[PDB]
């Protein structure tokens, strides 16, 4: 009954990239707009924006290189039935480090590579390699 | 599936039953060999397989196969059995160690002599 909105966000990106949709709209949230900024600064999406005041609408324009998606895989690792937290030294490297893992640290959400050089770990959200 | 159900009831490991239940963790046992006789195998094969009905020293009473060509077992010979089924005989799970305590080695083996227990034809 919509108990994970974060996995609903990655599912819309996954199904949108599979269906060759040019853009994906979803109900916005403070956490969704945070991890969408991680994908935009890392190059998986383009040009996310929030339209609305009381019921805001997160809208992401997906990315294609040739006739293929950019996110080949976007998994959700800490689902609400099983939360996963990692220390600094066992933060995962996804697809040998050429695909990022969004980790929620106490200094905001960032990639795993950003969290290692910042020196702290946290709840890992998704493997968006 | 469903990790919250495994917490309630963990993965039941399948127990493993032994295949030779004549006092497990014993490499051999010793029995007195009542009723040495010969029987017939299962369907695609045909011979006269020579078996014992040995009475083991722990109180069990099992049948055991006698390898090699011709034996000397007679009804009271205290022998030594080991594991290993035969597949041809319905419920023979053990072999007799040829060479041990009453079971002579097989006459005129010259090849694979440590099985069938014969001692290196000197001359």
């Amino acid at each position: 009954s919509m108990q994970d909105p974060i996995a609903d966000m990655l599912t819309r990106i996954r199904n949108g990239q599979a269906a060759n949709k040019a853009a994906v709209t979803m109900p916005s949230s403070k956490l969704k707009v945070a991890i969408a900024n991680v994908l935009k600064e890392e190059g998986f999406i383009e040009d996310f924006k929030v339209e609305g005041d009381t019921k805001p609408e997160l809208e992401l324009t997906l990315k294609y290189f040739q006739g293929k998606a950019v996110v080949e895989s976007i998994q959700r690792v800490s689902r609400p039935g099983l939360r996963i937290y990692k220390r600094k030294d066992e933060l995962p490297k996804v697809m040998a480090g050429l695909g990022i893992a969004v980790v929620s640290t106490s200094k905001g959400v960032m990639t795993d590579r950003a969290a290692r050089q910042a020196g702290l770990g946290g709840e890992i959200i998704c493997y968006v390699a | 599936a469903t990790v919250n159900q495994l917490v309630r009831k963990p993965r039941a490991r399948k127990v493993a039953k032994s295949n030779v239940p004549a006092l497990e963790a014993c490499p051999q046992k010793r029995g007195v060999c009542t009723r040495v006789y010969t029987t017939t195998p299962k369907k695609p094969n045909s011979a006269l397989r020579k078996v014992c009905r040995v009475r083991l020293t722990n109180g069990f009473e099992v049948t055991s196969y006698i390898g090699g060509e011709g034996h000397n077992l007679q009804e009271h010979s205290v022998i030594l059995i080991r594991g290993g089924r035969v597949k041809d005989l319905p419920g023979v799970r053990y072999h007799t160690v040829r060479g041990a305590l009453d079971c002579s080695g097989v006459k005129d083996r010259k090849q694979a002599r440590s099985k069938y227990g014969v001692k290196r034809p000197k001359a």
């Binding site: 190059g43 990315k63 040998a96 480090g97 050429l98 695909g99 | -």
Partner: protein, 157 residues
């Protein structure tokens, strides 16, 4: 220069009004040892007629796989109808530690140092296609930094 390898030969049957007709099916792989592998599967009435029919299908079904200086780029999974091949770059974890019918598809591509395991049905026809799509799903750092990130130094630090 185009090193070949024969995987397996079966004896398949047909069962017609007279009796049953036996045919032989040969599964082969070819490769240059450089990152270009292809497999062929031919069937014929004789064994050497099938192995050379399968080479010709293998020479024209070659695909290009980007391997990282003798080994893979990243771990990869390889599902294809009952075979669930997993691989690992195994950074000079020397040898092709891989099962039969996967050992030979890796030695002709030029891969020298994998760790690999075949889960599921280890049928040799399916595990060959299971690695070959699994090899081509593996992407290079200079081609993943062509779509995201957009320099090689950014995605690897």
């Amino acid at each position: 220069e185009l090193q070949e390898k024969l995987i397996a030969v079966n004896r398949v049957s047909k069962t017609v009004k007279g009796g049953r007709i036996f045919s032989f099916t040969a599964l082969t792989v070819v490769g240059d040892g450089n990152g270009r592998v292809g497999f062929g599967y031919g069937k014929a009435r004789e064994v050497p007629a099938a192995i050379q029919k399968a080479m010709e299908k293998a020479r024209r079904n070659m695909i290009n796989v980007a391997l990282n200086n003798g080994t893979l780029q990243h771990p990869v999974k390889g599902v294809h109808t009952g075979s669930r091949v997993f691989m690992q770059p195994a950074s000079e974890g020397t040898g092709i530690i891989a099962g039969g019918a996967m050992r030979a598809v890796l030695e002709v591509a030029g891969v020298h140092n994998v760790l690999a395991k075949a889960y599921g049905s280890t049928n040799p026809i399916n595990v060959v296609r299971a690695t070959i799509d699994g090899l081509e799903n593996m992407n290079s750092p200079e081609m993943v930094a062509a779509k995201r990130g957009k320099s090689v130094e950014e995605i690897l630090g």
